[PDB]
Each structure stands twice: as structure tokens, then as C-alpha cells.
């Protein structure tokens, strides 16, 4: 087509979605991790994670307001990844990289799994 | 902080939100324009438009599944702007610029109003 494109549009949309999350506006699901609860928007979770995409396209699970993650999932690793979903920023540190990579593999967040693998390989 | 950032994350999120819109997945509102109906996600509409942000933060309107726009709004102008919300791409043409600018002013989409004003000024 002959469209023009606003470079900062996608980043501005994500920034606003994160502002809605902060203020708990139109959040429609609670993700439960080892008795730690995280409110979010189903559509953002689906847009970021192969696991949530599969969960919320299921005819029965699409209607659930609570999703319980596998007990092996670390709440801090989940929190770091939820922050990444809404900001594009990943708080990757020596002390959390193993939990973050394990959580990203479970959530099916391929680009995160990739940078964790590379950061681990650099330290060996 | 000491975060790393994935450059393409925001664009990838928006691309996936548009794929959900195409497949009518988790759309939670119908926008009615001169008897033309458009399904969308409230959160994306709020992230893009000052008008929808005001509508869906209202304690009564946040719960509506149908929103009727002012009868002066042109369905094609709305369609072009809805496409822009989900893609960052604006199909601005000599034949639609007046309707697009009028719709963007009503929806409170300041960056669109700005490029329409500039494109109109160049033709005078």
C-alpha cells in the first residue's frame, strides 16, 4: 500500500497498556504463582507467550478469571517476565537468570530463552 | 536499572494483537459508526485514543459491549484509524484526509491530527 507509519506508535501503545496494568484498569485475569498473584490483561499475555496464547484460545479456559501456574515456577522469575511483556525491558541478573530462563521456557517466550542461553554461555 | 531491551518487542506485541483482532479472538466491544460495526479490544482502543480512554475508564461505560459513535463520523475514516491503532500504518490519501482528520480529532489521536494538518498545509 501507500501507508505512512508512526515509528513510536507500537512503543506508545505498550507504555499505555503498562499504565493500565499499574492502575489495575481492565485487567481480566489473575495469574497465581506459588501463592503470589499477578493481575494482567489476557490479550497482552497471549501476544507475549505461546503458553498463554494456547490457554486463552481454548474454548473452556478462555473464560477463566484465575490461572494457576505449575508449582515449580518461581514468582520472581514470573514477575520479571510479566514486566518484560509490558515494557520490552528484561531485568536479567546473575542471581535470577536460571529462574528467568526456566520461566521463559515454560511460558514459551523464545526471544527471552535465546538471550538467557547466550548470557549463560558467556559465563562458562 | 540494569535491564536489557528487546528492540522488536513492542512491534511484535502489536502485530499479535492485530492477529487476534483479525481472528476475532478476545474482542470485547463493538464500535458502531453510521450502522457499520467494528469489533475491537477495549485496551487497544484506550491505548490509542483519548476518547476511548475516557469512555472505558467511566464506571458505567467500562461495562458496555456496544459503543455508538456520533452520527457525523464517517465509517471509512474510522476503519482507517482502527487499522492504524493495530498496525502503526495510516492509509492517508487525498480522498480520505478530511474524514480521517475529523475522525482523529473526535477520537483524540493527537499524532494523526498532526500529520493530517501538515499534509493539508503542503497542498494549499
Amino acid at each position: 500500500d501507500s501507508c505512512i507509519q508512526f515509528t513510536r506508535h507500537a512503543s506508545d501503545v505498550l507504555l499505555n497498556l503498562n499504565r493500565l496494568r499499574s492502575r489495575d484498569i481492565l485487567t481480566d485475569v489473575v495469574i497465581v504463582v506459588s501463592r503470589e498473584q499477578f493481575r494482567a490483561h489476557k490479550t497482552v499475555l497471549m501476544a507475549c507467550s505461546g503458553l498463554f496464547y494456547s490457554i486463552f484460545t481454548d474454548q473452556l479456559k478462555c473464560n477463566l478469571s484465575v490461572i494457576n501456574l505449575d508449582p515449580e515456577i518461581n514468582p520472581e522469575g514470573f514477575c520479571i517476565l510479566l514486566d518484560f511483556m509490558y515494557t520490552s525491558r528484561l531485568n536479567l541478573r546473575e542471581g535470577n537468570i536460571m529462574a528467568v530462563m526456566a520461566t521463559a521456557m515454560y511460558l514459551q517466550m523464545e526471544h527471552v530463552v535465546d538471550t538467557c542461553r547466550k548470557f549463560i554461555k558467556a559465563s562458562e | 536499572d540494569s535491564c536489557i531491551q528487546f528492540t522488536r518487542h513492542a512491534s511484535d506485541v502489536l502485530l499479535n494483537l492485530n492477529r487476534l483482532r483479525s481472528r476475532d479472538i478476545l474482542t470485547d466491544v463493538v464500535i458502531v459508526v453510521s450502522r457499520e460495526q467494528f469489533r475491537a479490544h477495549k485496551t487497544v482502543l484506550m491505548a490509542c485514543s483519548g476518547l476511548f480512554y475516557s469512555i472505558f475508564t467511566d464506571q458505567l461505560k467500562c461495562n458496555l459491549s456496544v459503543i455508538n459513535l456520533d452520527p457525523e463520523i464517517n465509517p471509512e475514516g474510522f476503519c482507517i484509524l482502527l487499522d492504524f491503532m493495530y498496525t502503526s500504518r495510516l492509509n492517508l490519501r487525498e480522498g480520505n484526509i478530511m474524514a480521517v482528520m475529523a475522525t482523529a480529532m473526535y477520537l483524540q489521536m493527537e499524532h494523526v491530527v498532526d500529520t493530517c494538518r501538515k499534509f493539508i498545509k503542503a497542498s494549499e
Binding site: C3, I4, Q5, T7 | R89, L90, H111
Partner: peptide
Amino acid sequence: WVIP
């Protein structure tokens, strides 16, 4: 704004 740019030409994509």
C-alpha cells in the same frame, strides 16, 4: 512519521 516515515515511509515504511
